[PDB]
Design a protein around this nucleic acid. Structure first.
Ligand SMILES: [K+]
Ligand SMILES: [Zn+2]
Ligand SMILES: [Zn+2]
Ligand SMILES: [Zn+2]
Length: 86
DNA sequence: AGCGTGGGCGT
DNA sequence: TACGCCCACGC
């Protein structure tokens, strides 16, 4: 089911999509292709660079349906919304 | 809370 | 392959 395997001796993880294996390899090579223009920190993934930049800009696109409180990431809002339960 | 970052996936 | 979502986990 998951043909693409990690060729690293220490690792044993396997994947179903080659591009996921290609991504995974960066853990071992330590490559971080995506750099924040603001603080020069490097990141392994472009999507994580995007949410990181919001720490600098204060951009918060995700608002709680119940109280309107805003968050930088969707999963932050998700974690928050549940507090309005009983 | 604030956020790094891998997992799985659709496109 | 890249891009960028949700999703989850970790501190
Ligand atoms: K291996
Ligand atoms: Zn590996
Ligand atoms: Zn930065
Ligand atoms: Zn709320």
């Amino acid at each position: 089911e998951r043909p693409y395997a990690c060729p690293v001796e220490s690792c044993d993880r396997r994947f179903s999509r080659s591009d996921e294996l290609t991504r995974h390899i960066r853990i071992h090579t330590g490559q971080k292709p995506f750099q924040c223009r603001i603080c020069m920190r490097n990141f392994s993934r472009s999507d994580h660079l995007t949410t990181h930049i919001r720490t600098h800009t204060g951009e918060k696109p995700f608002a709680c349906d119940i109280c309107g409180r805003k968050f930088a990431r969707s999963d932050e809002r998700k974690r928050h919304t549940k507090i309005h339960l009983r």
